[model samples]
Every structure is written in structure tokens, then in C-alpha cells.
Target chain A: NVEQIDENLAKFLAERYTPESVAQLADRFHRFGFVKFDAANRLVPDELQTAVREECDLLIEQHKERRNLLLSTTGNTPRRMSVVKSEEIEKSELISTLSRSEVLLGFLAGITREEIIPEVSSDERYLITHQEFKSDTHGWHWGDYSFALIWALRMPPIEHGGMLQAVPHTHWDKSNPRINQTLCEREINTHGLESGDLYLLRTDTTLHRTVPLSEDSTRTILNMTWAAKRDLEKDLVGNDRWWENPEAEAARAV
Target chain B: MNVEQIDENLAKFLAERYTPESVAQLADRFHRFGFVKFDAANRLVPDELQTAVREECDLLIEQHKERRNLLLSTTGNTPRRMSVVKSEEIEKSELISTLSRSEVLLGFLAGITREEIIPEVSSDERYLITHQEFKSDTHGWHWGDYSFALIWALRMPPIEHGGMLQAVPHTHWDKSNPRINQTLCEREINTHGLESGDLYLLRTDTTLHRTVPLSEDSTRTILNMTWAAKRDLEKDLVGNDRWWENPEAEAARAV
Candidate 1:
């Protein structure tokens, strides 16, 4: 329930978010206003509580460093684009750089139910962005947060064809937008953003390009899934406080 | 062997009091005991080694526990003698009691080194003891260790006939020192005794046996042959352990 942040559940969550992932998770939840916890009353040990603050500080530092690097690297150079797990892990701490106008649809697997679980369960989804480069195949790419929480920022890379070009409301709107054999025209309200800018938009009802990857240069996107959720889509919802990671440090202690 | 004393080895013995019957092994070396008739070391795990010896005993207890449901019944009553024992008694009154042995030879199993290399290649023997006319043909007849391990104690009640075991050994002994067969039959060197409630160890030799009395009672015995030298028996002097490139082909040579 979103009525009030329960202390008992907050303690339970503090207990769950332990070890290295703790610092990363604190930033993720704190950004979303309040960290709602379950109704399970649990005691958080002093040692674990201290580690949680330390790890979260470390995660914040790393995120700032990666964001600066990703922007300077892929600012104007447009090449063959691809998305993969390593790309996510390498730029794990970086914030998304896609402009609002360029992003037809954005899939942010961040600070909610997880995204890596689906990629893990269906190994097929963990694709190789640069097949020629064998060293790029990695685990739980975008999710570097506490317990590998994934954060994805989607954008159509090509001039007319971004990595995943899609227009919100197209699927159910008056615009008979379709990506068929003859016609692939679509309108999307996406503005390319500057450095240090982040935004969330609804893109579920959009006719998005299934593969908005560049043809040459390696294009990466953050990707991951959580252990529990009705499915991948439902995991991103705000009311996912009870969703738990199976191998999270707290669960491992149990 | 019987004259000295009934050591721990006596526990594993099948008392002939149960004629034509054998007890299922209750334990391993715990029941199976051997001595260097001559001062040569046997291949079986050396006895004094504490761990191995205790393990053998434990295995024996477990082995017997598995069969406790089958052969737990026992009695020590002697049957009324129909007639007095004499050298000229009938066949039925001669044969007394009978006991079969199945787990007996298994004690010699590890002696063959081939077991360590290819455990599946080794083989064990079984025996059957048949007594009464009906039992010889039907119910009481035993085959191999599965059923031979039942002990039956018959004390010559109804003047039984045709009892006593006859055994034969492979032709591998030399006629040196009067040979084991001659020595045993001649009763010159009594290595052991052959009677109920007595355990003995004697070399295998061509032998024959018959009941001293000729009465109506009938008896039978299981003269099993196990743990024999295989150097020439199968026409291969070299043991199964050979440096052949193709084991399958090597095996086919015998076939």
C-alpha cells in the first residue's frame, strides 16, 4: 500500500539491501521519493546497517564517473549501433544520454522490480551487440545497482531510424502508424537531451522499432529483470515494494 | 583347527547340527576367518589393521541384518534316536544333520587382484543342498546362495537314510608330501573335523562320502567349488590384466 512508509517494512528492506549493493540501492530508492517497505518486521544489525551506507556512497561515486564518460564518447559520432549486456555493465554507472526527441521509446529497468531476470531466464535475450568481438558477452549488463538492478535508456540511433523508433499512443491513437512492408512512417515526441538530463515517459502504446541498433559502432543499452513480477512489463511499476531478489545479500544470509 | 578352541571364527560357523542347511552370512571377516596354514600372507585385508578389520566386521553385521527377516528361526532340540550308532547301521540312520554355505566362499572374493582392476569381471559361486525325496524334487530344494542359507537341524528321528557330503577339487595338486587328499582320507594329519557344530578349513581334493548307516532317512550336501587358480583353467596363462590396446577385442579372443 502507498498509504505510508511502514517502519517495520523499512527495516526489513534495510535488512534485504545489505553488502555492496546496499549503497547503490539507497540512491535508487531515495531518488523515487520514499522507500516503501513490506509489513514484515525485522531487525537490522548494526554491522549491516553501516555497510549499507558505505556501499551506497560508493555506488553514487561510480555512477557519476560513468555518466561523464558515456556522454563525451557517444555525443555526435553515429556509427553502426548495437545493444548488449557488456555495454550496460561498462556504462553501468552512467545515466542515459538519449534526447527526448531522438528517443521514440525508453525502457528504464531501474529502481523497481528487476530487469536482468528475463535476460537470464531466456539466454536468447542476452544478445551479443558486437558479434565479432567475443569478449563483449557479459552478465546482467545494465543493472549495476544494488544486486544488479538494471537501468535501460532506449533511443533510435539512426537519423530516421533510431535504435528503437516508436511513437507513443500510435498503437491506439488516430494515427494509423504501422511498420509494414511498404510503409514505415511514424511520429515520435522525443527531444535529444543534453548531459545530466533524465526523464521518464510512457511508451507502452508506441509502434517502436523492435531493433533500433546502429549498423556499425557498438550501441549498448542497460538491461536486466527482477526475480519476481507478473512479467517484465509489470516490474517497472511504482508499487513493487514487495518484489525481492532471490540471491540478494540479505536473502543469501538466510 | 577344531581341537584348539572356538575363537571369534566360531561365530561365523554353520553348525552341522542343522543338517543340509547353511546360515546366511551375518558379517564379513567378522564371520570369515583364515590363518596362514603355512606362514604365507593372504591377500585379504590384513586382519590386525584396526580400521580395515573393524570395517570388515561392520560389513558382516550389515550383510546379515539385511537377511534377518528371512532366516531368524532357530531351535536346538535333538530328535529321538531310532537306533544306536554303529559301523553296520542302515543308510537311513547314518545321515544326521545338514547345513549349507553360500556366503562362505565370498570371503575369498577379494583374494583375486582382478577385482581391483575390473570389479565387474570377478565371479562368485553358489550351492544347493537337497535331502528328502520330495524336497530333492520340489519345495525344500535350494539353488545358489539365495535359498541355501537356511539351517535345518534333524537328529535322525525317523531313521533317515542317504546323508553325507562328497566334494571334488580341480586337478592342480602335486603328489608331493602324500598330497592333501591322501592325507585327509588317511586321517593321518587331521587338519579339521567334519561334523555339526564344528568349523574347519581343509584344501580341496577329489573326495567321496556316504552315510555309514543304511536306513530310511535321506540327506544331502552342497559341495561348492569357488576361489580356484585360473592360470590354465581358461587356457590363458596371462591374467586378465594385459596392456592390450583394445580391451573389447582382447575379450573377444576368449569368445
Candidate 2:
């Protein structure tokens, strides 16, 4: 019984599916509940990669100088620039790729627009954001979506320390607000991916963290979430602002 | 024989106000998460003690400005930071001494007693106490295992004025995330709704945390008491190290 979910999720993750096969895979996804897709270089064009990379580097430098006073306290690590609204390069290349790539969205959404019908009206059919970080640390929290696709544009070497970690099969433990910190740290599955690698995550269930990076290392990942016909309106329009951002109303209350 | 040899006052206090199970749970949580808060419901410090301690802090502010500057640097040259007294200094004041050795504090420490648990390890371990003041724009962040940092809110700016003590939950156990130590002034969780006498305990070793910068023209005050394991007490060249020297090891005498 235990091996079945792992076997199915592993199979679904490794395969490149046809539209019909995507629907079959979606069924297995909903059954096994989580999957990972590896070797995902075809998702981005080489020209677009170079352009977006330069753009990311420019912003990283700009933020370092602009926020120097606050940035200095973080010790020697590269800080995070919450991918603000002004970066046009991301909109022109990265955002468009996520929106226009049919095969990419097809596998991510688990079938086509024709495959499943919607119940509630939604504003945008798709949304894209960059959960970019120059440093190695991120907190333990679940994503708002039923599913999410994360592609690494840049990752530090294992020696310098940027890696993804998650507690597998935690979707079932949804009610427990506090992820078992000790157990999660001890038993976490660590993933080190090459540039251009992509993986899908079951956002709502999996408790995850990015291990701290070496002071000299940097990481940039493009996060794309799918809004399917079956998704609730709330899930599709998740928190656009960081949950703890001071300007956010929820954070300002206290 | 079921009735054990116990003092009437001690037994009465236990039966009327405390429970072993609750104490054990708090200890367990400290070991696991590296921090815990004792809110109003379970506050250990009594109102009279809090009032007396606050009053003593106010008098200290009346000292000459020149003396205050020297006292602030007595600990270290931390920018935007000031304090009224260190552990050895506080012992000179009767009001502060009463508050320091109160049964409430001893009881709270007693619950978490264990050799490996720093402050609770033994009475011989010395502790440092100070009334710390943070000026606007002051901040610092880092990672380490110093046992425990117990803080009491003596005075704080309004929520809008910031100057909040905050931490990235669980970053203590995994400090490699340099971000937990970076840009802490903006991206962090603040200790909201703090009032005078509200106390918080932090597992300094397990958590990556920092103080939020006070907004412009604002200041915040807190009473900080930090305890160290026995091995940490040592003399250094600067020679302003009396706080770490507790020859009496007063805390160990409790049990």
C-alpha cells in the first residue's frame, strides 16, 4: 500500500505526457497526491535565459546598494529582493513563457482547458511570480495552491549550500499547524538541482524549507502556479503579498 | 506513607497554583522549539516586583548623562544601544535584588532544570541582568547557543513605532539560512502586543532572531536577563566581566 503512492508519483514525475496522457497523469496525481518532474531544460529558450539572467543580476546589485543599511545586518550572505512589480525583463520573457507554454502548462494543470470545466469565475487564467532569493534560507510553510511548479534558473553548489528540503507524504497532516521541526529537519529529503531543472510540488500539504546558502552563493527560482477548473476561487487568488510583509493589512493589524 | 514530607506553604502553593504536567510541557517545548512565552495567564513575576523594578529603572535614568554613557559602554560598544546596569551592578540595589531572587523566577527556572539546559543546569552558573534601551535605527542579528535569554517588557514603542523583538521560527535549529540573520529590520515577525511585565524566553542557540529597528525618534526599553552554562564563566582582558562571575552559584542552591 505504501509503495504504490511512491511508485505512481515517481512515474508521473518522470514521464513527458501527451494531452490524453496528461489527464491520466492528473488522475494519478490526485491519487498519489504529489509528484516531481526532473530534467526540465526545454521549458526555457536559451536566448530568454541569458536576458532574464542579466536582468536578475542587475536587480540583485541594485537592491544591495539601495538597502545597504538593512542588508549589512544579514552578515555576509546575499539578501532577498522580493521581485518587485517594476522589473520589465521578467514580464517580457519569464512571465510570458509561463503563460504561453502549452506543453508546460498542460502537464502542470493536468489536462487542457477543454478537459475540465469551471464552476466559479476567475480573474486571470494564470499567474506567475519569482520567489527569488540570493541567500540560502527560507522558512517552513505550505504554499497556497493545490499544486506549484518551481524551476531553478540558478543554484549554488552543495558545498556553498542551496538545496530544497521537504517532508514527504505530509499532505495528510494538514490540521497540525506546527510542522514537527525536529523530525522535519532530521528526516527531510534534500534535492540539489542543476540550472534549468524543474519540479512540481503539492503546495498545501508539503512543509518545506531551503537550506541556508554559503555566504558567496546565490539562488534564483521562477515559481509558477496553475489554476485549474477544479481549483477553488480562493486558491487561485492566493495571497499576492508576502504573508508577513509589514505593509500587508494582515501583518499591520498587530 | 502516601503523604510525603513537604512544607505546608510549599505544598499549598503547588496544590493551589501549579501543576507538574504544565511545567513539564513548558520544559518540553523549550527543548524542542527553543522558546516559549509566559503570557498574562501564566505570568511568573508578580505585579509588586514588576512595579519595583520599573521604579528602580526610572531612578537610574536620573544619573548624570556622562555616567550613563560610560555605563552603556561598560558591556561593549554596541551602537544605538544603552543599558542601566549589568548583573553585578543590579545586586547593589535592594529593589532589584528582591525582584531578581523572587520565588516566581526560581519556580520558572526550576521547571526546566537539567544539566544540558544552560540556565537551568545549576545554581553555580552566573546570569547577567540589565535594563536595555534601543534607540531608533538600532539593530543586530546572529546565531549561537547561549542557553536562554529571558526578557521582560519594561517599556516599548507603539506597534507603528516598531522596535519589536522578532525571530524566524525554527531558524535556530537550522542557521545556515543566512537570510534569517539578514535584513531583519524589515522581514521578520515582531513580538506584538507587548505590555510592561510581559516576559519572553528565547533559546538563543536554536533560533535566528533580531530586534526590529525603532522607528524615527522612538525608543524601547526591556529588562534582559541572560544565564550561561558553567563553562562560560571566565575572566577576559577588558576586566568588566563581573556579571559572568558568580562564586556563590546562587541558582544551584535552589534544589
Candidate 3:
């Protein structure tokens, strides 16, 4: 929402990203494709995590949309969640500060050892997705961004379901989605996480979905997408960002 | 271990995206075998870290090359020459810690095993332990001290040289004295081979498994690791790890 980043988020990044830790993470993420980041550990401090979650609570309270549709963008998979989209994300100062931070972007770049950038489309910044009902899910999908940073606001017990599973090395060309075809070719990995966890996904190539709640369980997460330089080149026409750009939106709708 | 392994919620979740036939195929693969092999290459086509972990294994293989024993002292039914640099020696190793801390590896194991994966309660049996054996040296039929073991087979001899892993599901280890021949006739033993750099997870406790001896002189090394299930965590680590301790001269005998 603004040009400047939060002071706390800045201070933490400066202190945390040494030559050693960044090198360690870069090697790990290079091999594994994703990392299990603990928000309480370093990414977000204790106060910041709660503040961000509270801000999300207010945003979802007002702007939440119950999306129960089969999204064509990700190969016609059912997306089920009480969601607050990217446009509504800037309503919070703390998260918008966190989202707009170039410092965080630089750190992500270091860990990935790739060129990472924030969303150019005003509305394609962040998402607050909550799954409360039984069988509710975010479904099997791939994000347009090469990487997505997620912070878990609330996670049910592991036995209650709501785990994160990804089919590694999978890809998507949303225009011609062969989701089922791609799925048949690969095995998926399911990750169980804690409430205060922060995780990154290689969304552009790795196909991922939330494991549905077996019982009526609550699992909420905040998602922010970061662009890869190559992914930026891949979308020269702004096809994926039409909804975020008013001029492109009008032209596409017609 | 059969149908009980399937978490119905997991099936319901995948069903929304995948077709019915594919879901059953996944279930069948998990059921028939304790594991499947896959590379994380699609998520990221690795360049150096893959080689980095391999180099780490090679060093351990070289360091622990001379230490070998047939574990007939532990039990006769599970007879194999033990060549391992145990957990303590490589506890500080970087690459081992990299894979040890991996959610990709953990999630992959959890996805196939259908269980909440946890570290072994006993540190002695936990983390990556190197097992490098030479020609005619093989780790024979044995049940693991825990529920799961992930073998990162970094280096392998040729298939003709026989570093293949063979296992029979639903088999038990009668610790003191084991009936190896009788059990082989009773159930079917399944076999799989790894082509250096392949990673595999196994239900080590329930599955009676072994690495058959090499037909000729070559080497095989695995940065093998362990994880516990709810059942595994409940047991005491005490009597379980006595096998790793030094053996007596009288105890050394052929299987």
C-alpha cells in the first residue's frame, strides 16, 4: 500500500540474514524446493505474528468471499475457502507494510538465489484464506507467481487434517490445464505444520493443495506471491494479472 | 497396515482434484509396498546441493569402510555385515542436517506412509547413519528398532553386484532366534533396486528387509535415517539399541 517497509520487519531482516544463514537456506531450498519456516522463530516476531493475524481477522470479517467455484486458472480444481482477496489486503497497515517490503523481497531472493520481486498488479499482493467446515479446502492449484510466502494464522491438529501437500516438479500453463494428466505422472508430498509456521512454495512449478478437514476444523493462512524474473518474462501480455489492472480488466471482460 | 493406513480425509481431499482411478492407484502403491521413489527435481532442478550431499556420503563411506561385522550377535534371522558410522559421528554434519530438516522429505514420507512423521525418540537410532558395505558384505533380514527408515542411497554398485533391497510385508523379527528359511516360504518377498541418489522410505519394523550381499567386489553407501510412528514413539529405546554397542568374541558367530 505504501513505499516504505515496517521498521521492525526491517530490523529483523538485517539481523537475521547473515552470509551463513542465507547460504544455508539457499542450499536447502535449492535441493528441496520449499522450506519449513517458523514465523515465531525468525520470519515474524511474536508480536508481529499476532498483530498480522489480528489484522487478517478484521479484513476477513468484512471482505471475506466464500469461493466454492471450480477455478479455471488452475486446471478446473474446486477452490473452497472463506477468502479475502488481494485488493482487501492493503486495509491492514502491518501486513501491507510486510507485503510491500523490498527488504523481505531481497531476503527471499537470497534464499532462492533468484531474481525476486513484489506484485506489480495493485490487487495481486496477498490473500487470507480460511477453511473451517469439513472437507473445505483451497483445492489443487498452482499460483502464477514462481514463489508464494505463507504464514499460518491457525492450524488444526495434524489428525484433524488440513495439511499442505504438493506434487513436486509439476507445472501449469493455466490456458491449457492438464491438471489430472500431470497429477498421474508424479507423487505428491504432504506437509503438516503448526499454527505459527511460515512456509514458501515453488508455486509456478510445484502443484499444491491443502488437505481437507476430516472434521469441522479451522485452518487459516495468509498468502503473498512474489514474482520470479523468468515468470515475469513468461507473462508479457498481463494475461494472469488482468483482474488486478482496471484497464486490462475492462478489455478482457469484453 | 492395510486399509487402515488410508486417511479418509486425505482421499477426500485428493478426490476433488484427481480422478477416482488415480486415487486408488496411489492407495494401492502405498499398500503393496511400504514406499515409492521420487526425485524433488521438478520443484527445483538442483545443480550443486545434490552433489554436495553425495560428497558428504562418500566421505562417511571412506571413513567407516574398515568397520564391518555380521550382526549374528544381534540375531541370526537378520544376518548382515554391519558397516556403519553411527548417529553421533555425523551429528554435526551440514548436508545430513539439510535432508534431516527437510519438510519436502518429511512431507513425502507422510504422504506415502499416511502418518504424522516424527523423529525417533531414541537419539541413538535417529538421524542419518551411514551404512557402506563392500563386496559379499550385506545387511541381512532384520526389523528396524523403529517404524520408518529413509535410505538416501547416494552410491550403489551395479545391479549384477547385488546391492538390491528385498523385503516381505507383515513379517516380524523374533529377536533372540529367528527362523529365516521358514518365513521365506510363508510369504512373498518383494525386491527393489536404487540407482545411486534415489531416496526411499520403509516401514522398517513391520517389513522384514535386507540388502542382499554383493556378487562381486564393489561398494554401496546410504545415508540411512529413521523416523517413528505413534506406535514406535510409545516403546522404550532401552533394550532396542543394545545391538549397536560393541559385541563380545563369544557372541560373534555366522548366521
Candidate 4:
């Protein structure tokens, strides 16, 4: 079962909501697939964001050994970054705090104009992505969830790489992932972010990736994932609970 | 120029065999049965190449991953026990480079299938992969992710000992939760016995197929030569595929 958002805090957060501004936010989100909100960056003050940033640093430090593996679901793409894997991602206190943040969920739900809830998969709730070295990249991929709010903690100059490149209006076929094929036909949009910048993306429709670092640079980010109502019904992956059996007890004896 | 001594041989054989009547004949049977067998033992593949591949298998034996468990997802939690050899292990093998790149062979498959056939995007599973079914080894029920695979039998056991190919063509590979037993109970499954040096083409993506487990364990080693439909080629052009650790085909890369 998924974690629940606090009802009282949600009510308190809603009181601070600028409903007048939310209508405009949804328009920009629908017109453009993503919304870059620099003003909303102040919604979480420097002091509060610092706590999340420190937690990000701590998680990054803990995940010292990077995962340099190819993902076949996204068409054998490379994921070369010091990103927190499963258990650590679930264990992070800050991750749990923000992921279960009813205030944030309500804010995103207001933008999406749909039922937006915290990710069903705990490990996917708060993705702390850190690109710390050369050749470090998060290769082209489609998100398993519907929406992603990437809050930049530390970013390098655009010239140093770490640009967020995306192809809009594309879908992922997990079984026969044809990422490269889609790239040939689509126009890619590349964006460079500054420190403390916040961007909300309709990740389910966009094929996105962090550009490979050419030199020593950093692209530390706190990516909070949320699922729309359709994300639960349309998603095909998370349903295979039987396949997730450790060692597949039925096959282990053979 | 992928590997051409075998290419010239295959081209010569095709030159002799190419005729509208025979091509249509192969196509007709392929369309209906989703399979067609031929003798590639010596006339198509040279004896030396086969011997070299066998020796390479000896070298690759160490690299083989034993798949001795049940696959509970695809074909309804079926069991498989086989020592499989990947394309990387045979990266430089003449058998792969020749069969994979031969335009003459591609034309044959194109004529037979009447579709624009493309090579597999997966470098490791591209040209050919070997499934060595030892005693009790069985490739349980499943369908290929790709469209086609040319199976080459390097070694085979007797029919009574198992290792026969069983199939239910024109079926979907509902991986989420496959009703394997229901399909078996509902449809008639065709079984074909193969001998050493036999080669057969199969439309794997639509055909639910598997090798029956050995009762005694003689050995059934077959190469799964994979290829794709033309539409598969343009599915994702986001990034370049294929990575190699070795050069000149002998250098190896570790996954």
C-alpha cells in the first residue's frame, strides 16, 4: 500500500494556496508540457530547502559506488550516475517527509488538474539524482510515473554539461523499448537549470535524460515523483507481484 | 564482408535454389506452419566452420549461464534448465558473422517471409545464441521479443529422449499473466523432431514455442539466430546501440 498524506497539514497548506495563481499554472502546464517556476522556488525558504539539500548530500555520499548499468526497458540506455538505489531511497527521512507532503501533492494536483498522489512505489517517491564525475549521465528514459518535480539543489554551468534534454509527446513501450528510434523522429528540447530552480514535468509523456558530463561537474537534484489516476491503470510494470518473488521459489529447486 | 567464405557458399546454393516456384513453396509452408526446415549440415555450412564453432563452445562453456529456474511471468510460470551461450561469447565466430551479415541469406529470408527483415538491435542477442540442453534441460514455454529466429541444430538427442520442438502458432505472448495451460488444453500443439545439422526458421514473436525437457539427457544444442521486422528498426533512434569489449571479433566485453 502507498503512504498517506497528512490531512491536517493538507488543510493548513491549502489555506496558504493562491488559487488565483493555480489556474494560470494549469494553463502553462497544458500549453507547455513542463512549467519552470522560479518564483515558486521561494515557496520553500532557503532554510527549509537546505535541510532537503543536506539530506540529498547525505544520500549521495551513502551511494558512493555508482550504478553503471544499461536498462533494457528504456532500450539498453546507460545510467551512469551516483544515484541512490532501492533500500536507501526508502530509508531516507527527508524523502519520506517530502513524498508524503500533502501540501506539495495538492500544489501539483492543482497544476495537473487531476488526482495526483505520491508514487505507489516507495523507492521511486523521492529520487535523489547526483552526477558527480565525467561521463556520468542519466541516459534517455521515460518515467514509470506520470509527473516529476525536479528541484535543483546544485547545478553546473550549461557549458559543463548536465543539461536536461527531452522529447515531448512520446510514449514508452517497455517490452520492445525503441528509445533511439523515437529520437530520430522527434525534436529534442534541451534546458539548463540554475541552482534552486524548480521544474514540474509531465514525465509520462516526455522521454528525458541528463546529458553526459564532459568534464568534472555536478547536477544534484531532488526529483519527487507523483502518479496520476491513469498512471495506476495504464502502467503495466508494477503489477507483476508474482515475478517479484525472491529467487522465484518455484524455480529455485530446479 | 562481415564474414564471406560461407557467404559465397550460401550465395552459390541460393543461385542454384532460387526459383519462383520453390520460393513460393517455402513461403507458403512458412506462412501456414510458421516454420520451414532445411539441411545446412555440409552443403550450406562448411565442416571446418562447424568444428570451429564446437571448439568455441568448448571455450564458451565456461561463459554459459545456467538458466535452471521457472519463468513465472511470460508463459505461465514454466521451468527451464539450459546452459545458454550468448552472442558475445561467439562474437568473433565465423558462424555468426557469416549468417548475420550475408545479404544472400537475408534475401532468402525476405523472399520467404515477404517482409523487410532487419537484424536484431540487441548486440548480444543479435546474430545467434546457443541453448545447450543437457540432461533434464528444457527451454520452457515462451515467445520471442523479436520477430524471427533461425534455429540451427548443432547436436541432437533421439526423439524418445525429448528435445523436440513444440509449438502453438498464431498465439500472443501475454507476458503479464499468460494462460499457458489453458492454451495447451484449448489448441493442438505441433511437435517436430530435429537432427544434427538441421536448420529451421521460426516466427517466434507470434509462435508460443519451447523445447520439451530431456527425459534421459543426451544433449540438444541449437543456435537461436535472431532478426527483426523492418518496423522494429525505427522504434527508437534515441541512442546508438551495441557495445563491444573486444576488437577483431575475438576481444570480449563483459556485461
- Scanning candidate 3 chain B in windows of ten residues, the lowest lDDT window is B39-48
3 against 4, candidate with superior DockQ: 3
- lDDT by residue (tens digit), candidate 4, B1-255: 336666777677667756767788888988887787875322334444554555565566556544433343335656555666657666666656566666878887788888977875667666544454566778778777678888877666656678889998888766565788899999899998876656788988788888888886466777676888975665542111111111112111222
lDDT of 3 by residue, A20-131 (tens): 8888988877665677776334676554675687788888788777655556566556666687878788777778767757777777778888877775445667878889
Candidate 1 lDDT, B16-101, residue by residue in tens: 21122112231222122221111111111111221222233233333321100011011011011111111111111111111111
What is candidate 2's lDDT per residue for A1-254, written digit by digit as tens?
23343344334445545657666756645544444444432433333444455555565445421111111111122223344332333344445443445444534565322222222222222222233334536545555455555656665545555677766555423333445554545467677665556666665656566676555444666555544444655432322233223232212121
Q: State which candidate has the highest TM-score.
A: 3
Candidate 4 chain A worst ten-residue window by lDDT:
A240-249
DockQ of each: 0.00, 0.01, 0.01, 0.00
User: What residue pairs are clashing in model 4?
Assistant: A178-B236, A179-B238, A180-B236, A180-B237, A180-B238, A181-B236, A181-B237, A182-B236, A182-B237, B246-B251
Query: Which rank order by TM-score, best down to worst?
Result: 3, 4, 2, 1
True contacts kept of 1: 0.00
Please report the interface RMSD of model 2 to 1 decimal: 24.3
Candidate 2 or 1, higher TM-score: 2
Q: For model 2, which pairs clash?
A: A74-B182, A136-A213, A212-B176, A212-B177, B123-B251, B123-B252, B124-B249, B172-B206, B172-B207
User: Residue by residue across B214-240, what tens digits does model 2's lDDT show?
Assistant: 654544566655565444445222322
Give me the displacement of residue B89 in model 2, in angstroms: 2.6
Candidate 4: count of backbone clashes, pairs at least 3 residues apart or interchain: 10
